[PDB]
Symmetry: C4
Subunit: 33 residues, 4 copies
């Protein structure tokens, strides 16, 4: 239930790291700080 | 309701695959492991 | 409250379109189907 | 609890800015409006 939802919201806030590592991919393609 | 929210959180954790396939796009542009 | 959360989960499932339009950016950089 | 979830959904709708700034990276690689 409640603590299912909050601990999926755990996973998403891992996928929004995997967002950071998107950018750090893009900043590879750019060599940008 | 509760089980609406948990099964949107189903969809998001599909969109955060569609994140994986972003990266696997970027790693196309880079030919990187 | 409940119907705050479900209608943020509205917004996210708009941001995960704005994911589609990431890819359709990347597929610009690639000219890929 | 409820107001934990709504204020993670705060963070996500920050990560879906950090989506905008993905695109504004991609539009760097493209020089596109």
């Amino acid at each position: 239930x409640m603590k299912x939802i909050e601990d999926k919201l755990x996973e998403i806030x891992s996928k929004x790291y995997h967002x950071e590592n998107x950018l750090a991919r893009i900043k590879x393609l750019l060599x940008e700080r």
